[PDB]
From a paper:
[name]-[name]-2 is an enveloped, positive-stranded RNA virus that enters a host cell by fusing its lipid bilayer with the target cell membrane. The fusion reaction is facilitated by the virus-encoded trimeric spike (S) protein after it binds to the host angiotensin converting enzyme 2 (ACE2). S1 contains four domains: NTD (N-terminal domain), [name] (receptor-binding domain), and two CTDs (C-terminal domains), protecting the central helical bundle structure of the prefusion S2. The [name] can adopt either a ‘down’ conformation for a receptor-inaccessible state, or an ‘up’ conformation for a receptor-accessible state; movement of the [name] allows the virus to protect the critical receptor-binding site from host immune responses.
The Delta variant (also known as lineage B.1.617.2) was first detected in India and was quickly characterized as a VOC and has since outcompeted other variants to become a globally dominant strain within several months. The Delta spike protein fused membranes more efficiently at low levels of the cellular receptor ACE2, and its pseudotyped viruses infected target cells substantially more rapidly than all other variants tested, possibly at least partly accounting for its heightened transmissibility. SDS-PAGE analysis showed that the Delta trimer peak primarily contained the cleaved S1-S2 complex with a cleavage level very similar to that of the G614 and Beta S proteins, indicating that P681R has little effect on the furin cleavage. 3D classification gave three distinct classes each for both the Delta and Kappa trimers, representing one closed prefusion conformation and two one-[name]-up conformations, respectively. For the Delta and Kappa variants, the FPPR and 630 loop configurations are largely consistent with the distribution in the G614 trimer; all are structured in the [name]-down conformation, whereas only one FPPR and 630-loop pair is ordered in the one-[name]-up conformations. The furin cleavage site (residues 682 to 685) at the S1-S2 boundary, including the P681R substitution, was not visible in these maps. There are no major structural rearrangements in the Delta [name] with two mutations, L452R and T478K. Neither binding nor neutralization of the Delta variant by most anti-[name] antibodies tested here have changed, suggesting that the two residues are also not in any major neutralizing epitopes. No obvious structural alterations were observed from the D950N substitution in HR1 (heptad repeat 1) of S2, with multiple pairs of charged residues in the vicinity that could stabilize the packing between S2 protomers in the prefusion conformation.
Author numbering:
A (entry chain C): 730 to 836, 848 to 1068
B (entry chain B): 924 to 1162
C (entry chain B): 689 to 729
D (entry chain C): 1118 to 1162
């Protein structure tokens, strides 16, 4: 998903002026249409977040006795002690993306936007709720394999699930049994290398950060355009209304209405086109949740490089991270 | 067959009873209708001209007055078409994506069977039936769903004459007294045999391997064939 | 006596799985289910 | 048990000779040694 944005077209074009509001009604539905367009984007963020994470209508939980055959999921399962129940790798993910306004009340670029009739609306699902849906997906995966996708969750021992996987890639199930300490050690060691990567490099989350940076850059650009004159005697609306009577003010204000309205149509077009990029990505992530997490995929390089075994979802700021496990 | 026939019945009764189900197709029909009405209502807007009616400019003003007012209507109107065509291009990109997905589900769920979990309905995909709809497609996906489960004790492998044994397909299970072999998606237990299983390695390496005798379907077929032969030798005391 | 309530949403029923290092569940029966899915074209 | 038959040795490009073991074989031929000593012993009474 991306940050939900609500703009009041009238408060942006016409900051507290009756004169400018009466001139803005000469355009008619243009102001409402641009709020309808941004509302269609704001609503499908919650849809995209539902499609990706709300794949199970039941919240699976891991047992207290972690006897997963030697496979140590403790760095990707929930942490009880942390104030939000995210995993250890999920906490790194939340530190490694930077936000321009989360939308959670005020009591600086966040301030400049709000002073100009631009607002960020909060997501429906909190970052605790995405951590809980991720816990359900991961606990269903560790304890039940693909079966919680196809119906009710059926328990299976984790090393026995991994055996079904191995048969799934055309390797005989005794190749697991005869090597289970090695396979668990390699898995545990590879979950270790995820941290020693993400802890130390800045660029790894770059797809999520670039999505945040564009919504920030575009809101900054829509803030800046209020400084354009558009051929009026000032960029500032009150300075026109102060220095001119109605018969001359209407000519000047009509320029600023025209230029600000063309600026909003640009923002809303850029945001609708961008919103298509995110919907394609949400449909991809919901498909990868369905086919790499809730299952095993025989689709080459669809679930990470190598022969796919299984995958684990993680919550991230406005995104998902998939830890794909592959036999190479 | 009865479950399928009844489920097709529940589709008829669902699409009779509920209002909202076609809400995707209805929302597409509403979007293009509302956009066309928005485009026509935008003709009544002045854009700062002395009227939106074109003749009320052309009569009530002279040529070089009127051209300044008519150019407001031309500007505003042209921007109204550019907005409608931008909204329709962006809309058409969503319907395209949805048509390429529908063509993919026609290819993979209707012309085939999908091993892609949750792609062709929820559950294990069996088959799908297409139905036409106004500006859309409806798929009736048919899926097999596991229903009444029982718990069982299980094991990674079985030991017999000091070698380990593993299922060829399926899994081992125990009802508490006897071990069986069964297919991993439906409970149909069988006596564990050398035809259900294959062998690899000695009994030490497999974590969690138990002890349970394995049957050999060649064996009593040879051993009864020892008593027949044994009977011959008894006969051969007599002649 | 009806009124608009407001609440923090629940994400589903809480359900710990019966997991153990030697326990399996197997379905003795199944349902055929038919689900409609609708796409604009 | 590891292999299946189809056709004869002329048609397949790049085919090679090797022996193919049958696991029924010594399981019957041991049952011939189990028989032969019984026939030899049953000469003795
Ligand atoms: C685990 O599954 C086993 C196989 O179904 C089952 O063992 C079977 O139990 C029945 C009795 O409930 C036996 O049936 C025979 O019993 C006597 C034998 O003289 C006859 O009067 C009956 O007509 C019938 O032939 C089966 O022989 C027996 N099979 C085996 C292989 O021993 C267990 O009872 C099940 N255990 C649990 C805990 O449910
Ligand atoms: C499954 O069946 C196996 C075969 O019966 C059984 O292995 C046997 O286990 C016992 C106890 O550990 C061994 O007993 C001997 O132990 C040492 C020699 O290793 C001696 O000092 C003792 O006096 C005694 O003779 C058997 O030797 C051993 N058999 C083999 C072939 O190694 C498993 O223990 C059984 N497991 C379960 C879970 O039942
Ligand atoms: C693979 O093993 C085969 C079995 O030993 C062997 O086939 C044999 O090849 C020879 C030489 O070509 C044939 O010899 C006979 O050929 C004709 C009759 O068919 C006569 O005119 C000859 O005088 C001679 O008797 C064998 O008949 C043939 N045996 C069979 C059962 O086909 C292959 O040559 C071996 N090939 C390799 C690459 O190892
Ligand atoms: C599968 O078994 C679990 C619990 O394990 C069993 O516990 C003993 C009482 C005995 O039955 C043993 O053979 C097993 O080891 C079941 O989980 C319980 O479900 C009930 C509600 O039905 C609930 O009150 C308990 O608190 C649950 N216990 C735990 C630890 O989760 C599970 O329901 C069984 N599966 C089926 C299909 O019935
Ligand atoms: C799973 O891996 C974690 C991380 O290596 C293990 O947790 C460590 O356990 C040791 C020994 O008790 C402590 O010294 C460390 O401080 C722990 N680190 C953390 C992050 O908790 C855990 O013990 C492993 N699980 C098993 C079953 O071996
Ligand atoms: C809503 O606004 C009020 C201030 O009008 C905030 O109340 C203050 O909260 C801080 C921090 O807890 C206290 O130190 C002050 O003493 C409070 N002042 C008053 C007048 O009560 C309140 O925190 C705000 N709430 C939110 C969610 O923004
Ligand atoms: C398969 O490769 C693994 C490494 O991925 C080998 O495991 C290592 O073996 C050496 C000794 O040969 C040890 O020093 C390492 O500690 C082992 N690594 C791990 C992760 O356990 C393994 O020996 C190879 N197996 C075979 C049959 O060749
Ligand atoms: C599998 O479940 C089906 C229902 O989903 C069972 O079929 C029903 O059985 C009851 C009697 O037990 C009948 O009254 C119903 O009329 C049956 N319905 C249908 C559609 O036939 C079935 O008995 C179960 N099978 C097993 C082996 O447990
Ligand atoms: C399974 O767990 C029990 C404790 O619940 C333990 O006694 C047993 O040794 C374990 N067996 C295996 C094969 O891990
Ligand atoms: C014993 O063998 C003879 C042939 O040598 C046969 O005629 C006779 O029917 C046999 N009787 C029995 C009881 O096997
Ligand atoms: C492989 O091809 C070469 C010719 O390029 C030929 O001499 C050789 O006998 C062939 N070997 C096999 C196993 O087909
Ligand atoms: C020989 O046959 C007799 C039965 O007539 C049997 O008691 C004895 O054990 C046999 N001996 C051998 C070495 O087979």
């Amino acid at each position: 998903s991306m940050t939900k944005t609500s703009v009041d077209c009238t408060m942006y074009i016409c900051g507290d002026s009756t004169e400018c509001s009466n001139l803005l009604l000469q355009y008619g539905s243009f102001c409402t249409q641009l709020n309808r367009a941004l509302t269609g984007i704001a609503v499908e963020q919650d849809k995209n977040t539902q499609e990706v994470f709300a794949q199970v209508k039941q919240i699976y939980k891991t047992p207290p006795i972690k006897d997963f055959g030697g496979f140590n999921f403790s760095q990707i399962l929930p942490d009880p002690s942390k104030p939000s129940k995210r995993s250890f790798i999920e906490d790194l993910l939340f530190n490694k993306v930077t936000l321009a306004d989360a939308g959670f009340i005020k009591q600086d670029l966040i301030c400049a936007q709000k002073f100009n009739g631009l607002t960020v609306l909060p997501p429906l699902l909190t970052d605790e709720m995405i951590a809980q849906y991720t816990s359900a997906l991961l606990a269903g995966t560790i304890t039940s394999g693909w079966t919680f996708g196809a119906g009710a969750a059926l328990q299976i021992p984790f090393a026995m699930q991994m055996a079904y996987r191995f048969n799934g890639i055309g390797v005989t199930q005794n190749v697991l049994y005869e090597n289970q300490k090695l396979i668990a050690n390699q898995f545990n060691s590879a979950i270790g290398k995820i941290q020693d990567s993400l802890s130390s490099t800045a660029s790894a989350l770059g797809k999520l950060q670039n999505v945040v940076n564009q919504n920030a850059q575009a809101l900054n650009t829509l803030v800046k355009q209020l400084s354009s004159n558009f051929g009026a005697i000032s960029s500032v609306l009150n300075d026109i209304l102060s220095r001119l009577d109605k018969v001359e003010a209407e000519v000047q204000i009509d320029r600023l209405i025209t230029g600000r309205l063309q600026s909003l149509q640009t923002y809303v077009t850029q945001q609708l086109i961008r919103a298509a990029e995110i919907r394609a990505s949400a449909n991809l992530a919901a498909t990868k949740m369905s086919e790499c997490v809730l299952g095993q995929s025989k689709r080459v390089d669809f679930c990470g490089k190598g022969y796919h075994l299984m995958s684990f979802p993680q919550s991230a700021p406005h995104g998902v991270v998939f830890l794909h496990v592959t036999y190479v | 067959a009865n479950q399928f026939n009844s489920a097709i019945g529940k589709i008829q009764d669902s699409l009779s009873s509920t209002a909202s189900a076609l809400g995707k197709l209805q929302n597409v029909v509403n979007q293009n209708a509302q956009a066309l009405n928005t485009l026509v209502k935008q003709l009544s807007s002045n854009f700062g001209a002395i009227s939106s009616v074109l003749n009320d400019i052309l009569s009530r003003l002279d040529k070089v007055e009127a051209e300044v007012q008519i150019d407001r209507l031309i500007t505003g109107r042209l921007q109204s078409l550019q907005t409608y065509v931008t909204q329709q291009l962006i809309r058409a990109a969503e319907i395209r994506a949805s048509a390429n997905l529908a063509a993919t589900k026609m290819s993979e769920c209707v012309l085939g069977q999908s091993k892609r979990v949750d792609f062709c309905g929820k559950g294990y995909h069996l088959m799908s039936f297409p139905q036409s709809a106004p500006h859309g497609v409806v798929f009736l996906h048919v899926t097999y769903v596991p229903a009444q489960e029982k718990n069982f004790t299980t094991a990674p492998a079985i030991c017999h004459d000091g070698k380990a044994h593993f299922p060829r397909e399926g899994v081992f299970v125990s009802n508490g007294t006897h071990w069986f072999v069964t297919q991993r998606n439906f409970y149909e237990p069988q006596i564990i045999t050398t035809d259900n299983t294959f062998v690899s390695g000695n009994c030490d390496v497999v974590i969690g391997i138990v002890n349970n005798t394995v049957y050999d379907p060649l064996q009593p077929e040879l051993d009864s064939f020892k008593e027949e032969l044994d009977k011959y030798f008894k006969n051969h005391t007599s002649p | 006596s009806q009124s608009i309530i407001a609440y923090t949403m629940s994400l589903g029923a809480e359900n710990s799985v019966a997991y153990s290092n030697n326990s399996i569940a197997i379905p003795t029966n199944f349902t055929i289910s038919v689900t409609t899915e609708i796409l604009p074209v």
